[PDB]
Amino acid sequence: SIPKEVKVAIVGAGMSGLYSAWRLQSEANVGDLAIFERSDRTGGRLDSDLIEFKDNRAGAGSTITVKEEQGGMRFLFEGMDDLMALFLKLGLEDQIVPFPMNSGGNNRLYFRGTSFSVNDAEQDDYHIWSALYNLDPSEQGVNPKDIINVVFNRILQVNPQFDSRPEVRGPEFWQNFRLQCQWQGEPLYNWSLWDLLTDMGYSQECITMLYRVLGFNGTFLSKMNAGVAYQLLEDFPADVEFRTFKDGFSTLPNALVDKIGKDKIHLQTSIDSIAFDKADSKYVLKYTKIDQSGQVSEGKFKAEKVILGLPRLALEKLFIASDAFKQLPKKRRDELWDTLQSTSNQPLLKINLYYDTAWWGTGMTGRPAVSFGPNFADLPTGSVYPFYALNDELAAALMYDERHATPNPDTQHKLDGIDAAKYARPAALTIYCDYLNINFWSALQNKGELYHHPHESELVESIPSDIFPASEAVVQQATQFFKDIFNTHYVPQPTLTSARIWEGNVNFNVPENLQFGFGVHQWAIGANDKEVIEDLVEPLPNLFTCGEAYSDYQGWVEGALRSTDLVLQKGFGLAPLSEVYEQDQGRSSSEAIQIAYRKISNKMIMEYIDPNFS
Amino acid sequence: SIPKEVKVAIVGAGMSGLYSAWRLQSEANVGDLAIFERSDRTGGRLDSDLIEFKDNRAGAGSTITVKEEQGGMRFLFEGMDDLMALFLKLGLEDQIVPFPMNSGGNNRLYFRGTSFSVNDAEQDDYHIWSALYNLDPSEQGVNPKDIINVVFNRILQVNPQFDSRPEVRGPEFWQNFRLQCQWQGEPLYNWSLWDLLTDMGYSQECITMLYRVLGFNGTFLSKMNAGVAYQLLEDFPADVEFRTFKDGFSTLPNALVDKIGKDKIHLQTSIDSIAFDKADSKYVLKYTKIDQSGQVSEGKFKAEKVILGLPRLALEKLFIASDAFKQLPKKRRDELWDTLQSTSNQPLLKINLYYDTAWWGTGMTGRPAVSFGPNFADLPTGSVYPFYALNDELAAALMYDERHATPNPDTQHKLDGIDAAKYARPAALTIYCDYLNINFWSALQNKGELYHHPHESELVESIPSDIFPASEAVVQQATQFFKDIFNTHYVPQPTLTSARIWEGNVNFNVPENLQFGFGVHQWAIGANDKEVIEDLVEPLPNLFTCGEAYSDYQGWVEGALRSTDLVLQKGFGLAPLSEVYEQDQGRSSSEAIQIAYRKISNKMIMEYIDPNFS
């Protein structure tokens, strides 16, 4: 049942769409709104899976749950003030757990046919990098990641006009960085990182090493500009403490759906075109809907205000098909189109292989155990992340680990036991790659038959609907790269697989359950994003645009929230959520979340790890 | 003056457009046609430059001409039967000269920070490749290019149903190859070459070596399918004898313009949209024109039949904007759009740096002289090709070289002198790269000020209009890669530069003199090009499509000619030019051209090289 008219029509049930609705209902007393989502699910590029494995351990119809992510997976307590405020208002802080990023040096590295560990790579003044890559002398004997850091320090040094003092470097800092810092008299948003490092004197061997060692080679090889590249590369410092949700990032959009009401959310309802009815000064939205039978249906409805919570490709499709846009004067039509081109499309993919037990621990490899964080490679895998069965005791040990406490031998012995026990429960690996590596897997995923473990139904009760199996060809090639990376003959067949290629589609032959947008976006060369962003808040009277793609904090939920807040301010009078939170609470979202989590983790530790913890 | 109506409207003055017009006038008695070209020039992706350098040698207002190419540059006597027939009918055979592809082993190779020669790489059972790349044992001790050849032989071996016997392997053979040969039960057009070699057991190190050593990394890293990849990779065998035109490939389209008449050719006239007038059963073409003042102008005219001699991107623009296409039923509209997606867009670029003298000969390097053919590198240059001042004596020596004659010491001594003399005349290097390397140069080309040698006007009289200078940043980075590749401290500043990035544009901010299509196209994964090709001949009644992009012989003029011939057959009754040539002449275009060139080169040799030659 699609209403004949609403006061606010929201297009897209991703974070931007759900967040708009929630804030409008809760703070602007707007009850007459509706959300229209082309897919059969909410959340967009947040997409968690909770798999209930048959527990077939010896002493066990009992079930073990493995959380995995097909989209976003992690966040930070600082520099994400809207997100934190959002978590606190929805009361989700008690589900926050660690997202560790290292195994104390045991994580794998695979480069130029050679498998080794992070610890190994440090040995002998980082000698291994100078053996694998033909580096200039000034490039030898230093940790590759530290080259990125040093170059960052150099950019700041030669831009003394640019105030580099704030301790928390959020979207503002990063915008001024790319728009006002220069190199050789050209501001960074006119640079590519590839050109920049080359101009600075780096060898192409060194540059290849960097874009392979860092995982996201798009920062170097795509059309994104060097300033925004650096915002992403300086997001994963050595000392990072990322967190996530026990049940996955989808906890967040599922919570918003609850507050919104499923009755206002129209799934399998794609907005095809938008026109303006000059008589009653209202927009007219043409849609297509698929009921639960397959019964297709076309229709139309009106809205006083329209909120397009949509990325670049989706906006371009609407723009091309929409009289509201076509009726515009030539000059402004073309200017608006050119503005949509100012953010690069960044493909990403995640392929998840689940296993009845984990095989990368010392028991199965005979080598130092791999636990958490990226296993990087110049293979097409890009980055490989382990996930483990949900386990409260394990999460507590990880919480203890987030402190830089010195356990006594009793506590170290218990932590040892907990670290080893996770290998005996179901687990998963995520292959997580970008740009240059996409095409290897997409051709593999669409060829031949799909993978299913025999007796799959005996292994997992219900397989979530958003799971499309990896192709048999994907599993076989992934299995061989895993043997390379983890330096082991032993990599068994997965119990369950999923493949998700976040690469926008323009082909009408693709089912709706397989149409996905680009993974993230990043400002292109020459893009003055300060102008672009304000231009896209409300490009036509009462029609708004918002989301990650043209945001301040690309690649992250926080960017979607901040871009949406701009729409909520200009079109509805609402101040930014983080400022509203601080007005209502007397303190920042950031301080609040840290105090609340500290308390939760304090008691988690005392209860599971060390009864006498500080 | 744009006619109110024509019987045939031809859109695009590239090879397909000019060739359509010429054959229609000459063979179908169609005089009432006109060509409409959006740019200020004919020829499209064929674009030669003839630069007249001030001759500032000691004993010399005399001029020296350097031919260069910004687009296509070479052809073959076999497997290009339409092109050869076309050359013969236009009487252009006497301007055909060699296009040599090697320097007897002295061409440069630069990989993983190491500069060496083709001869060097052969040494010690191809040891250098096993030192630079961490190869499997089965991958060691073999010439990299021979891995591609061997794998080709393996594909044929396991497809005995596929008749692999014809000596001249033209478009038909290559189509059946990619559509009917399989690997592991999947036909090649469902494969990517990257996936294919990986599945066959090759190391990623070996695969990286191959796509770097072979120049065109798009065959591996793009979305083109493995079958068409192989058509391109098996086009440059060791023993190739390419030819070209003394004054450049544009000799061909300039000759067609002459036969057509400039009066039927409408430059700076872009067709924006197409509609069908059901009353008088005629198409209505909306255009925009820019006179010689900058005076813009919009208008409309009708045509009985429309020939779109246009590549993928240009066709998609028209399709989106055209009522003739929009009025189509949903199902067929989407099917036609999806069909346009079946050929991948392959960016290419050429950056030409001209020098008053050549600096890569032994006199200037102290190393074995570099003469002709690609200098490959894993640097962003991709491939570097030398060009020399036009010189009849040099062309004769090259003609002698095409024979595998054994000169006596008198003839060898003269050839030695001729080889060395070309270094003392103006010359040029072309940087010629694809896919992965494009983004490095485009960001560099659009940053900062453009390069001009001081006193440029004293060095070259008139600079052709199609020359856009390379950026200063492009020249500085090219200069350093040249020192790397040619292993020399000495690389002077160029007298003149051009940059051409064959990468399609969707941004209204780009001048028309800087809008260029994608370099070439190649069938995508899953594309049944036999179905696609016939579907695109005449997608609407009396509206036709033709050109390289959706052709049988992608990457080459011959593909444009063959795709156009299909339009000439279906819509106008003309048989293929090569069959028409053979009917009129009693022998094939291929035999004719070889005999005529043999005669021309025979007399060229006797006159310049060896008075007593066989």
Ligand SMILES: Cc1cc2nc3c(=O)[nH]c(=O)nc-3n(C[C@H](O)[C@H](O)[C@H](O)COP(=O)(O)OP(=O)(O)OC[C@H]3O[C@@H](n4cnc5c(N)ncnc54)[C@H](O)[C@@H]3O)c2cc1C
């Ligand atoms: C692989 C990956 C990992 C990530 N990891 C993280 C992470 O760890 N941390 C983090 O903070 N961020 C992460 N992100 C980013 C984060 O997921 C996104 O920034 C955010 O979820 C996107 O929200 P959005 O509302 O802007 O767009 P989307 O999530 O893309 O929502 C747009 C919605 O609109 C719908 N739609 C499109 N067109 C139409 C139409 N015509 N009619 C109706 N509906 C339509 C789409 O189906 C979709 O649901 C990740 C992203 C990717 C790709």
Ligand SMILES: Cc1cc2nc3c(=O)[nH]c(=O)nc-3n(C[C@H](O)[C@H](O)[C@H](O)COP(=O)(O)OP(=O)(O)OC[C@H]3O[C@@H](n4cnc5c(N)ncnc54)[C@H](O)[C@@H]3O)c2cc1C
């Ligand atoms: C770098 C490079 C090197 C190459 N080297 C070789 C080689 O050595 N040998 C070889 O055989 N082939 C070579 N090729 C391929 C060869 O140049 C092409 O296959 C052929 O010239 C293309 O002809 P076409 O008519 O299909 O298209 P195009 O040459 O692209 O012609 C299309 C024309 O239509 C015009 N146009 C577009 N849209 C409109 C519109 N709306 N209204 C009006 N006009 C419009 C364009 O300006 C253009 O002039 C090379 C190609 C590239 C990119």
Ligand SMILES: N[C@@H](Cc1ccccc1)C(=O)O
């Ligand atoms: N939040 C993203 C960050 C990202 C942005 C852009 C590209 C890739 C990654 C992540 O965790 O992976």
Ligand SMILES: N[C@@H](Cc1ccccc1)C(=O)O
């Ligand atoms: N004729 C092209 C062949 C080619 C096709 C496709 C891509 C690249 C090159 C050339 O000489 O370069």
